Amino acid sequence: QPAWQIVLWAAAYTVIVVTSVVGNVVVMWIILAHKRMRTVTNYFLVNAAFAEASMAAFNTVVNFTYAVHNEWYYGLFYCKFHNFFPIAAIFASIYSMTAVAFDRYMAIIHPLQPRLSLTATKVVICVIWVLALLLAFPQGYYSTTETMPSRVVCKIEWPEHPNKIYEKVYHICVTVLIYFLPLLVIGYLYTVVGITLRASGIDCSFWNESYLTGSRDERKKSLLSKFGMDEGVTFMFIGRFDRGQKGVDVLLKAIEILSSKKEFQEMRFIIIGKGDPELEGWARSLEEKHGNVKVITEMLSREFVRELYGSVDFVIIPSYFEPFGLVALEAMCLGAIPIASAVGGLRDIITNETGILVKAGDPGELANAILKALELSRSDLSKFRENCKKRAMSFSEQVSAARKVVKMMIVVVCTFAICWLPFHIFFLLPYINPDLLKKFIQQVYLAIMWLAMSSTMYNPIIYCCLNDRFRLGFKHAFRCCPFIS
Ligand X SMILES: CCCCCCCC/C=C\CCCCCCCC(=O)O
Ligand Y SMILES: Cc1ccccc1-c1cc(N2CCN(C)CC2)ncc1N(C)C(=O)C(C)(C)c1cc(C(F)(F)F)cc(C(F)(F)F)c1
CA angle 99, 187, 325 (to 5 degrees): 95
- Are the C-beta atoms of residues 331 and 315 closer than 8 Å to each other? yes
User: What is the binding site for ligand Y (CB under 6 A)?
Assistant: 59, 63, 83, 86-87, 90, 139, 171, 174-175, 178, 424, 427, 430, 449, 452-453
Q: Which residues pair with 268 in a beta bridge?
A: 234
| Residue-by-residue DSSP string for 411-429 | HHHHHHHHHHHHHHHHHHH
Binding partner of residue 196 among ligand OLC, ligand X, ligand Y, none, CB under 5 to 8 Å per kind? ligand OLC
Q: Is 194 in the site for ligand X (CB under 6 A)?
A: yes
| Region for residue 114 given its phi and psi (left: phi exceeds 0; alpha: psi -120 to 50; beta: otherwise) | beta
Q: Which residue is nearest to ligand Y (CB)?
A: 86
d(CA 27, CA 50): 9
Q: Is 171 annotated as a binding residue?
A: yes
d(CA 325, CA 346): 5
Q: Smaller CB distance to ligand OLC: residue 224 or 399?
A: 399
Q: Is 123 in the site for ligand X (CB under 6 A)?
A: no
Task: Tell me the window of 279-287, 327-335, 405-413, 433-441 that interacts with ligand X (CB under 6 A).
Answer: 405-413
- Are the C-beta atoms of residues 335 and 209 closer than 8 Å to each other? yes
Q: Is 420 in the site for ligand X (CB under 6 A)?
A: no
Binding partner of residue 58 among ligand OLC, ligand X, ligand Y, none, CB under 5 to 8 Å per kind? none
Q: Is 458 in the site for ligand X (CB under 6 A)?
A: yes
Nearest approach in angstroms of CB 66 to ligand Y is: 9
Sign of CA dihedral 153, 156, 161, 164: negative
Q: Is 194 in the site for ligand OLC (CB under 6 A)?
A: yes
Is residue 139 within a helix (H) or strand (E), and if so which, with residue range? helix 118-142
| Residue-by-residue DSSP string for 459-478 | HHHHHHHH-HHHHHHHHHHT
Measured between alpha carbons, how far apart are the two ends of the chain, in Å?
47
From candidates 130, 165, 192, 429, binder to ligand OLC by CB under 6 A: 192
For residue 270, CA distances in Å to 31, 227, 255 come to 54, 9, 11
Q: Is 84 in the site for ligand OLC (CB under 6 A)?
A: no
Q: Is 176 in the site for ligand OLC (CB under 6 A)?
A: no
Q: Is 418 in the site for ligand X (CB under 6 A)?
A: yes
Q: Which residues contact 326 (CB under 8 A, 6 or more apart)?
A: 199, 200, 201, 202, 345
| Region for residue 316 given its phi and psi (left: phi exceeds 0; alpha: psi -120 to 50; beta: otherwise) | beta
Nearest approach in angstroms of CB 184 to ligand X is: 7
Q: Is 15 in the site for ligand X (CB under 6 A)?
A: no
Q: Is 428 in the site for ligand X (CB under 6 A)?
A: no
Q: Is 237 in the site for ligand X (CB under 6 A)?
A: no
Which one, of 148, 73, 438, lies nearest residue 156 by Cα? 148
Q: Is 74 in the site for ligand X (CB under 6 A)?
A: no
Binding partner of residue 72 among ligand Y, ligand X, ligand OLC, none, CB under 5 to 8 Å per kind? none
Binding partner of residue 413 among ligand OLC, ligand Y, ligand X, none, CB under 5 to 8 Å per kind? ligand X
Q: Is 415 in the site for ligand X (CB under 6 A)?
A: yes
d(CA 424, CA 165): 18
- Are the C-beta atoms of residues 449 and 66 closer than 8 Å to each other? no
Window 49 to 68, contacts with ligand OLC (CB under 6 A): 50, 61, 64-65, 68
Window 261 to 320, contacts with ligand X (CB under 6 A): none
Bridging pattern class, strands 293-296 and 267-272: parallel
Q: Smaller CB distance to ligand X: residue 188 or 211?
A: 188
Sign of CA dihedral 411, 414, 416, 418: negative
d(CA 49, CA 411): 16
Q: Smaller CB distance to ligand Y: residue 9 or 474?
A: 9
Window 333 to 372, contacts with ligand OLC (CB under 6 A): 348
Q: Is 474 in the site for ligand OLC (CB under 6 A)?
A: no
Q: Smaller CB distance to ligand OLC: residue 371 or 462?
A: 462
Q: Is the peptide bond before 149 cis (omega within 30 degrees of 0)?
A: yes
d(CA 85, CA 88): 5
Amino acid at residue number 32: L
Window 117 to 146, contacts with ligand OLC (CB under 6 A): 122, 125, 129
Q: Is 207 in the site for ligand OLC (CB under 6 A)?
A: no
Q: Is 47 in the site for ligand OLC (CB under 6 A)?
A: yes
* Counts for the chain of helices (H) and strands (E), in that order: 16, 8
Q: Which residues bind ligand X (CB under 6 A)?
A: 80-81, 84-85, 95, 98-99, 102, 109, 127-128, 131, 137, 140-141, 168-169, 172-173, 176-177, 183, 186-188, 190-191, 194-195, 410-411, 413-415, 417-418, 458, 461-462, 465-466
Contacts to ligand OLC by CB under 6 A: 6, 10, 13-14, 43, 46-47, 50, 61, 64-65, 68-69, 109-111, 122, 125, 129, 184-185, 188, 192, 194-198, 323, 348, 403, 406-407, 410-411, 414-415, 418
Could you tell me which residues are annotated as the binding site for CP-96345? 171
